[PDB]
Amino acid sequence: PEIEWWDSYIIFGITNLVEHPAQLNPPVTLGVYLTKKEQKKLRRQTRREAQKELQEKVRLGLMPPPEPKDISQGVHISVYRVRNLSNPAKKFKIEANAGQLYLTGVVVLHKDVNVVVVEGGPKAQKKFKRLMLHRIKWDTNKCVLVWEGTAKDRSFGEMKFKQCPTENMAREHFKKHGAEHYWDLALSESVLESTD
Amino acid sequence: VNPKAYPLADAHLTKKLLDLVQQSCNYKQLRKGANEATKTLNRGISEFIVMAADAEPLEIILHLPLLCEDKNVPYVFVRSKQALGRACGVSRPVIACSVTIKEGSQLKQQIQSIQQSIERLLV
Amino acid sequence: RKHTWMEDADSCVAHNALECARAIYAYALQVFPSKKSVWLRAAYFEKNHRESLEALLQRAVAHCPKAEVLWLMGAKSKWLAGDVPAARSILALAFQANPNSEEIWLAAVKLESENDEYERARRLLAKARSSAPTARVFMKSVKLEWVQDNIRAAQDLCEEALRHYEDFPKLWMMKGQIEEQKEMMEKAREAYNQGLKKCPHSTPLWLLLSRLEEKIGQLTRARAILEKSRLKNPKNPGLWLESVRLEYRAGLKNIANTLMAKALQECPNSGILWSEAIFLEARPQRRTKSVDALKKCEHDPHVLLAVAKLFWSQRKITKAREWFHRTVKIDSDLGDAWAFFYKFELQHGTEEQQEEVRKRCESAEPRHGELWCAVSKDIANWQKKIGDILRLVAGRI
Amino acid sequence: QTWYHEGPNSLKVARLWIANYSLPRAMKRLEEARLHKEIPETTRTSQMQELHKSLRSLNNFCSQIGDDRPISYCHFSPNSKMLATACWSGLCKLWSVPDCNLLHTLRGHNTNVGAIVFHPKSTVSLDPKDVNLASCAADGSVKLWSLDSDEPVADIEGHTVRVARVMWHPSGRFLGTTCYDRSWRLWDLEAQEEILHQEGHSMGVYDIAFHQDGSLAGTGGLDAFGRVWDLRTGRCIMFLEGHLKEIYGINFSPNGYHIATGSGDNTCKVWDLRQRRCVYTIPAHQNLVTGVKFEPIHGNFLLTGAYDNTAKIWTHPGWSPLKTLAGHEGKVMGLDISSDGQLIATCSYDRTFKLWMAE
């Protein structure tokens, strides 16, 4: 590069002009808790109202008296690394949990590097992490959580078990959905775990 | 609000904190009052400590985050003490509450989520 | 039927007497020859209840071949009661029955190093290293070379043990202890760092590295090494206790209390962490901290030793003696609890309580203690007795 | 709807001085980039491999506790002299690096101190009796402080909101400060007054950092929109977007294209300036990335902290996990590399500050 963009724009464009450009917004109900006495008073009032309604209905002659007797505004996106997706029930249970949890993503498999990326709500991501980390029993084959952050919107459409024997094809498939950085970080973490 | 009250939660954060405080007080896992919160933080059995920014004076709650720096507990300040008192199941306003951990309670995941969400507000 | 007879003999030995149990053990030994377990049980019953133990050891050596544990117990009973050169001849005869240098050569080297003529011990260690080399034999050879004097041959043997047994942190810890006893101290820190980076999970090597980085000044590097040891395990109770002790050694009492609270939140079922939190607490606040330590970590020797120290500090000798007796009954192998019981018997009580504490320390050998390992790992008190080590642990409190 | 407003002539004179000081600096940076581009790929690859091997064996040492308050920010002094820390208390100590000895702790604040960043030419060509460091608190205060006085100077009362961070200009005569009043102030050292208040975000700005040449200045806060405003007449055209969380850290690379922004969405945005796009979205950690620092004048790496107990030193470019500089016990708030590149301090919420040195 010969010069930068601001250096080419300035070189004379300096003046005493302060501006406020691009004022954009960044991408509510409160419950009430009632004490035991308040709950008892409400129950008494409701019972009195029901008794009054029954008395009015009986006195009206209508019936005889009873006989005496959100993916928006932030989506939690996790990415885990597994040594072998061979475990059918464990992988199936984790995938089933993610699918039952209205969570999208992908499950890419490779030589000793399996990247399972899920994206959904926080209560679904916590359940998927508890399923993949405590419920799904893998065993040398272990599953660890590589990353867990937040994104603006979901990237993938649905959980599709992709497969690529080489890292370049899986990286291109992740870059087609705009998630090649997480797969590259998972591959780098797998290489650092295998080297150390 | 008070500038000394830090950190300050948002609207949905205070709603989730009030729901967790009501679930803890209904399951007998919450202690209301500043002295009970100080006793729970001194004993090391308090999972979280919530304060009120609408306290006059707020300095009587000022030892509540500092004890949170002595026992490694998350601290948060509510918007009003009357809302914290109504969420604690009492007609009187509460200025300081302590949600304590229990032996395998069902609200441990919600308490862990509230501790994870309250640790990012103080920055 | 032999297992039921051994169980009945053990129940009779634990119940009322020892003559019928010894008769049942002799009947089970004379009915059919058994493995080393029944011979070890008979040797333990003879040692717990002089001549009968030597006769049982001779019968086990004559009727049960390939029993290194029974031969070692017979050699120990001959060295303690009978004679040391007779136990040396018994170990030499057991070396002609078992050609393996795993435990017989180390016992012969220990018997030759407990007495004089340490050149014979060095020759036996060299023969054990040339016949069947191992990490424990090399560590025993380095200890026998470093107990006399810190010679360069001991450093060369420690370097050869670190080059041949780099996976074992004991050789790196011995090399760091040999280099720390020299004039310089950077070589011991480098050897401790190599042992911490080569194990990679070595708790006593990291504790020695933190102690060397704290005692030689610049305790910030010691705190960094303690944090790396706590994060490298991860969340070890010993590394957290060492970091809490390093924080309490300085003027940062609030940081030490925060580290103790973090260690209790990361490991509540730890006796040493509960004892450190009870000792770091206040004097009117210790009655609740000891109750919380007893409720969280029940039937623990370190928590009982901390309760005994709190009862002795509160001018209650009748409660401190009962807590020391409960600590000795829960775990008699503890060194710190036995040292605290000996200090409580020497501070408050007659000579009968001190004699009973000395008999309890000489019956079961204390190990894995805080004050016991500080005097048992030094070269000046390596070949000493148990009573002198207990007196040195009680006098240094 | 970019509305324009006229300013004073002193702000225009300071903008003309900043342009006249940045244009030969940009010319020298372009000449250095053309000289580095003329170097062959073999020696550059060998230097990059040597830098990666030096950054991979980065051990943490000299973890000296500052005070009982957790450390919120750290700034390296020029020429590897010291390191100014800013904890949650009112004191701003200056520890002698790599000796880890505190000396001349600059106190004078009442609330929780924010980012105490020293001047880029403080230890180089400025007197120690004059103003050398600039600190900020949780209230509205931007106070100058010396290195051998242990007392603050005449602060700027033009900020009435929570001043999160403050960073001095590379020229030395200016200093930006990100306040919580949905604007960022630009105080002057020669004029001794606030020259401009650029409001480029709807929410309060958190981190403000100028470029390597001093022409541009990157902003960012709770409005989730990174603005790169020019020092001549404003007009931020390099708008950074994509992060759904609050931008808590901004750092300008010595190269004219790359710019690192740290957000709370567990990612870091290395965006380009010649294309006005995001070149890399690196998942550095899983916690909220608050601290972020660029490389020195060599320009090879980037050290990004987070709310976890670790800090990732990644390559620049490439966005690869080169070094995991863990060892802390709290949220890593504030980190700065030295001017020599061999030492880097990372303040954390465990009330301690260590330094990563090559083994």
Numbering used by the authors:
A (entry chain J): 385 to 395, 412 to 427, 434 to 475, 536 to 605, 627 to 683
B (entry chain M): 6 to 128
C (entry chain N): 539 to 587, 590 to 937
D (entry chain F): 164 to 522
Paper's wording?
Here cryo-electron microscopy analyses of human CE pre-B complex and B-like complexes reveal extensive structural similarities with their CI counterparts. The results indicate that the CE and CI spliceosome assembly pathways converge already at the pre-B stage. Add-back experiments using purified CE pre-B complexes, coupled with cryo-electron microscopy, elucidate the order of the extensive remodelling events that accompany the formation of B complexes and B-like complexes. The molecular triggers and roles of B-specific proteins in these rearrangements are also identified.
To that end, we first determined the three-dimensional (3D) structure of a human CE pre-B complex (previously denoted the 37S exon complex) assembled in HeLa nuclear extract on a MINX exon-containing RNA that was previously shown to undergo exon definition. To enhance the stability of the CE pre-B complex, we isolated complexes at low salt conditions, which led to the formation of predominantly pre-B dimers. Single-particle cryo-electron microscopy (cryo-EM) followed by 3D reconstructions of the purified CE pre-B complexes revealed that one of the major dimer classes comprised two similar units (protomers) aligned in an antiparallel manner, whereby each of the protomers resembles a CI pre-B complex. For example, in both types of pre-B complexes, PRP8 has an open conformation and the BRR2 helicase domain is located close to the PRP8 reverse transcriptase-like (RT) domain (PRP8RT). Moreover, the BRR2 helicase domain has not yet translocated to the PRP8 endonuclease-like (En) domain (PRP8En) nor docked with its U4 snRNA substrate. Furthermore, U4/U6 stem III and the so-called U4 snRNA quasi-pseudoknot are present. We previously showed that the U1 snRNA is base-paired to the 5′ splice site (5′ss) of the MINX exon RNA in CE pre-B complexes. Owing to the poor resolution of the CE pre-B structure in this region, U1 could not be clearly localized, and the nature of the molecular bridge linking U2 at the branch site (BS) to U1 snRNP at the downstream 5′ss could not be discerned by cryo-EM. However, protein crosslinking coupled with mass spectrometry indicated that U1 and U1-related proteins communicate indirectly with U2 components, mainly through SR proteins that interact with the U2AF1 and U2AF2 proteins and SF3B1 that are located near the 3′ end of the intron. Taken together, the molecular architecture of the CE pre-B complex indicates that no major rearrangements in the pre-B complex are required for the tri-snRNP to subsequently interact across an intron with a U1 snRNP bound to an upstream 5′ss during the switch from a CE to CI complex.
